Amino acid sequence: LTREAYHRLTPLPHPGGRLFIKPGARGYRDPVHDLLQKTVEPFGERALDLNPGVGWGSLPLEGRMAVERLETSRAAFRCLTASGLQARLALPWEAAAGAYDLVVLALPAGRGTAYVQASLVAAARALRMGGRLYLAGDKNKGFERYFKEARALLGYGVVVRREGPYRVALLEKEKEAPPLPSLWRAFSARILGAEYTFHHLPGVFSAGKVDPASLLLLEALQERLGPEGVRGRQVLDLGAGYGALTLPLARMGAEVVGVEDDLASVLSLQKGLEANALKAQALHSDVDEALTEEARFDIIVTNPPFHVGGAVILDVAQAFVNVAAARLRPGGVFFLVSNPFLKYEPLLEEKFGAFQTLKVAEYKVLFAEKR
Numbered sequence: 566l567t568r569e570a571y572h573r574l575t576p577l578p579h580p581g582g583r584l585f586i587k588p589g590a591r592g593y594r595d596p597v598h599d600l601l602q603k604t605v606e607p608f609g610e611r612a613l614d615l616n617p618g619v620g621w622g623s624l625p626l627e628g629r630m631a632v633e634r635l636e637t638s639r640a641a642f643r644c645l646t647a648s649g650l651q652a653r654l655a656l657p658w659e660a661a662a663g664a665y666d667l668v669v670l671a672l673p674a675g676r677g678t679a680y681v682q683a684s685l686v687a688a689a690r691a692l693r694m695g696g697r698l699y700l701a702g703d704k705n706k707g708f709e710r711y712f713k714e715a716r717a718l719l720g721y722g723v724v725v726r727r728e729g730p731y732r733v734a735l736l737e738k739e740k741e742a743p744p745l746p747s748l749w750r751a752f753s754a755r756i757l758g759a760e761y762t763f764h765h766l767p768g769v770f771s772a773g774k775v776d777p778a779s780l781l782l783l784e785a786l787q788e789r790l791g792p793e794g795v796r797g798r799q800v801l802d803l804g805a806g807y808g809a810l811t812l813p814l815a816r817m818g819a820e821v822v823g824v825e826d827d828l829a830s831v832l833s834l835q836k837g838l839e840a841n842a843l844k845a846q847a848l849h850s851d852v853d854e855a856l857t858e859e860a861r862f863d864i865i866v867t868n869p870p871f872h873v874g875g876a877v878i879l880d881v882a883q884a885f886v887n888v889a890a891a892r893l894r895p896g897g898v899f900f901l902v903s904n905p906f907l908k909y910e911p912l913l914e915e916k917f918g919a920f921q922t923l924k925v926a927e928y929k930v931l932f933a934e935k936r
């Protein structure tokens with residue numbers, strides 16, 4: 566995709582209306598969300614969708630109920646807003662307590678047990694007594710385990726739709742919801758001779774330790790540029806996460822801008838910067854969406870997202886490369902780290918003209934220079 570194509574919102578038809586989607590937004594052609602859309606029916610007057618993506622799963626409620634939507638992904642909120650669907654940039658556990666008759670939750674299984682648990686308790690807290698929860702998931706991705714927990718939190722629950730491994734259940738709140746679990750975690754790490762304490766909420770990439778690929782990028786970068794090679798330089802960190810690259814680069818004296826699509830990760834980065842007395846811009850952004858048109862950088866770094874077990878580079882990750890080439894000043898440099906068999910080489914050759922391989926073992930670090 567071109568950068569314009571990556572950022573473009575496209576409306577797709579459904580009976581009676583339209584829904585905007587875009588590359589990089591969850592909830593489109595997803596069997597879990599599709600099964601929800603075929604299942605959900607109004608109950609009471611006020612609904613909350615805790616993981617809406619582009620908003621397909623709970624769409625049948627729109628115009629029959631008041632529907633609120635809490636979403637962490639910037640890309641998804643762009644779509645919801647374009648679709649005219651009320652939505653807030655919000656963590657699931659920011660939901661108002663006892664204010665809803667119906668909650669809809671496509672299980673965020675990809676973000677892990679702690680994130681799912683926090684979402685389940687948020688659901689239980691959001692509901693009034695006697696309110697109901699639609700819970701959708703995948704038997705291959707913890708549905709039975711999470712459905713059992715939902716039943717324990719709420720009361721009576723039953724599967725109301727099934728297709729292959731995919732399930733939707735309906736549950737009733739029959740008991741008081743517990744307090745939110747503890748959400749924040751911290752860990753220390755020594756990187757390039759300096760001590761850092763990272764802080765993060767559930768669901769982030771590489772919770773609890775610095776990812777070895779990220780460490781490798783930093784090692785390649787300091788070897789190439791020197792310990793002073795980053796001072797006073799403008800750096801963009803594409804997909805900043807809780808700041809494994811952002812914090813050390815800020816420490817080394819770079820003026821760093823982190824862009825990150827996931828709200829929980831942006832908040833994590835912000836807490837880490839504060840805790841380590843470091844300053845950087847921690848932007849909630851779909852790739853470079855939050856930047857001015859004119860913004861350019863001296864150095865761009867990235868450990869792009871990847872699909873677990875997948876052989877194909879994600880649209881978002883392809884866009885990171887395209888945006889990197891476009892956002893570098895002449896003579897600016899790009900560092901990217903990935904699993905060794907992801908086909909980044911032809912992409913860098915296309916966008917930069919040439920590239921180098923600075924490291925290759927458990928991961929590869931690729932390098933390019935703007936001409």
Ligand SMILES: Nc1ncnc2c1ncn2[C@@H]1O[C@H](CSCC[C@H](N)C(=O)O)[C@@H](O)[C@H]1O
Pocket residue numbers: 589640770771776779803804805806807808809810824825826827830850851852867868869870881
């Ligand atoms: N559309 C998008 N725009 C910006 N960041 C995105 C994105 N899609 C995924 N990401 C982020 O890309 C990151 C890739 S994982 C790398 C995290 C961090 N830089 C580290 O090295 O530890 C995740 O934090 C993920 O949420």
